[PDB]
Amino acid sequence: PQLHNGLDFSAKVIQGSLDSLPQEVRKFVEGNAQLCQPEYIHICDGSEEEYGRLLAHMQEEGVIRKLKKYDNCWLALTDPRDVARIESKTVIITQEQRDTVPIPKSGQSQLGRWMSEEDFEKAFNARFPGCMKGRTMYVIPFSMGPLGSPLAKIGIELTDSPYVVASMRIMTRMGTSVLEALGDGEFIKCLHSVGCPLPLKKPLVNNWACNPELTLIAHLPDRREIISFGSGYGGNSLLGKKCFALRIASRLAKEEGWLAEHMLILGITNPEGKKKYLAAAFPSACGKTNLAMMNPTLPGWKVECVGDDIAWMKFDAQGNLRAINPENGFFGVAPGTSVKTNPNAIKTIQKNTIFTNVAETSDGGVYWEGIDEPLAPGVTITSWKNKEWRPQDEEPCAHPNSRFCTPASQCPIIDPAWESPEGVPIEGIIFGGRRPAGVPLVYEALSWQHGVFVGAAMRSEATAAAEHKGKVIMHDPFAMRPFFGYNFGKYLAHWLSMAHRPAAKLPKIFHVNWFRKDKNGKFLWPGFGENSRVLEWMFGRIEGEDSAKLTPIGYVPKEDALNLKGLGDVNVEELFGISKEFWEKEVEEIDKYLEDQVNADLPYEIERELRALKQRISQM
């Protein structure tokens, strides 16, 4: 079939067989092997022996260190320029711009970045030709969702970073059994490269191979392709997480009729024996992981964790909205995680966990800000910059966006239906962000349409998960601003259309704010385990208890409707204070934002809720 045997990469396969691969799978592997020119090709099988050889390889290349204090835990320190997502270098390629972002009325679109095919080709040809020279191309066959389940989606990631392969083994379900489940079916084509072909022209910081100047994460939904270059951080390199399960999945969900959302899933049980499932959409670094793994302070309540970041939801035949966690592990923020805030997280990360950019103690342990554990005398701390660190400096010992990567099956409170292919019925949906003033502790939407408007009007302070600085209050509708896969105006219409389905059991919609501050600059709510008190009120509202009070913004708890026993000193007057002067400015910013950003793709019912809220506020 060839004249010079120049396209047969069989002699370069150090594990696996190209003959064992399906037709379309082999075409994808050999095609990019010819483009990127790798030295070897490694077809992953997901085995324990393979994981052990990846760790030994990375340990011999100085990429990771062994944390001798714990059981099979490893530390990785990256280049300081490659620490988080780059929303400014994340682009979506479609034929028409309106398929990706609503055409703005004045400024530029904040709902995503669009790039034409012609411009992307020039960028692609300036990066990937010969980028894997001297490196190994790993072929990762992974599954998002329960393997063999009809709702699961299979992808193939090609990467030249064993750090990516190890993390993908934790965060997804990968191995040979996924290749057997695929057969001749469709799959998502994922291609990733660090952008440092050997020999190295640039010296690497902390042995972290990266090309920051040429970083680009592109999505082509019409071709089911994800192409990422330059970065190694999880949000940019683990292509099955944000790039696949959110951006690409959101467009597919619009086509097929389901939902891909940036939400946790938890089940909560009351002292009476009843259990309900909720989902909460908070922006990045705004409390999802701490809520899904919460240890309640109310006796008789139990919280079990289904997922903490991504949910795939769909109405079933009976009218129930059912949700599954497509992920296989947790990729959580490290700073702030202590025994008092998230004790269930501490139990989980003690084994088989890969840390990134946290500090290391001299006895082989981890350390970060807010760990709230004193160290024994003589224990020294090495910061994430691989330097000696003292508690009386300015640089923090761990990076503000440092992460841990741990398997979900090790969580002590993991829900016994987190791998069920049928999903869990969602009875409530929670929105919320970081609002230091004005927004009360909790309130409930008036209807399905008002609730969609509440999610569309979400605002929060900027966090360390992106490149935003200044703690400026930005819009983050549905906590999906960095992850929209298609036109946000059509996104809003897709949510509103669920109220038309026959026998639809629409969940209630709440809005919370754990981050309201007083005049002094400190928080008014302890949060963390005490958030169970707010969840108790939600549980009763779903059961139909008459414990709400009508306000111009929604239903708030009545007086003495929240269990505050054990606190008492809480200033309830400021936790639920509704200032007319605050909400008159808030509706103006929402009006100017929606008019400019959504423009002619704004559904009428969203405009009707904006008008109704403005009227209810003017009557105060």
Ligand SMILES: Nc1nc2c(ncn2[C@@H]2O[C@H](COP(=O)(O)OP(=O)(O)OP(=O)(O)O)[C@@H](O)[C@H]2O)c(=O)[nH]1
């Ligand atoms: N004051 C207060 N802070 C909280 C609370 N819950 C979480 N936090 C802090 O918020 C930070 C973000 O917590 P996470 O739950 O890990 O962030 P996330 O929402 O999962 O963000 P992503 O994982 O990037 O999607 C943590 O470092 C916590 O210290 C809370 O209830 N009250």
Ligand SMILES: O=C([O-])C(=O)[O-]
């Ligand atoms: O890392 C994450 O999960 C994020 O950015 O939300």
Ligand SMILES: [Mn+2]
């Ligand atoms: Mn997230």
Ligand SMILES: [Mn+2]
């Ligand atoms: Mn999280």
Ligand SMILES: [Mn+2]
């Ligand atoms: Mn309608």
